[PDB]
Subunit: 44 residues, 4 copies
């Protein structure tokens, strides 16, 4: 019972880290896209 809980808890913590890394990387990609967008807005 304790061993099952630690397996589930360890799996959740791994998914929280992967979710954190994917959201961080997508936010940076969005920021980059917005900079390109703003360069296009002015230059057009």
């Amino acid at each position: 019972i304790e061993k099952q809980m630690d397996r589930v808890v360890k799996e959740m913590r791994r998914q929280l880290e992967m979710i954190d890394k994917l959201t961080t990387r997508e936010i940076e990609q969005v920021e980059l896209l917005k900079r390109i967008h703003d360069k296009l807005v002015v230059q057009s």
Copy 2:
């Protein structure tokens, strides 16, 4: 000239494609944050 006007029109179309890309990426981030909050 016509070549300059064509490229300006292409840039405006690309602004629309970038907007769709940022909207989808932002919405994916919102979902991921909602999933994450289920657990914390």
Copy 3:
């Protein structure tokens, strides 16, 4: 999700993002050149 599958998709988007930056940079340069020649 698996970390290797997530890194594959993210790195591919980053590569496509760099191509969008280079292509829009070239498009900005084209408008600048066309205006400079036309302005003479």
Copy 4:
């Protein structure tokens, strides 16, 4: 008659210009709402 049609068409063109002005404002309103929405998302992470 041709003169009646010219009056009607000129009036229709005036209404199309009002749609143009409304669309210009709608462009800004949609852009502002999207920028605010996206900033709220990013800040909340």
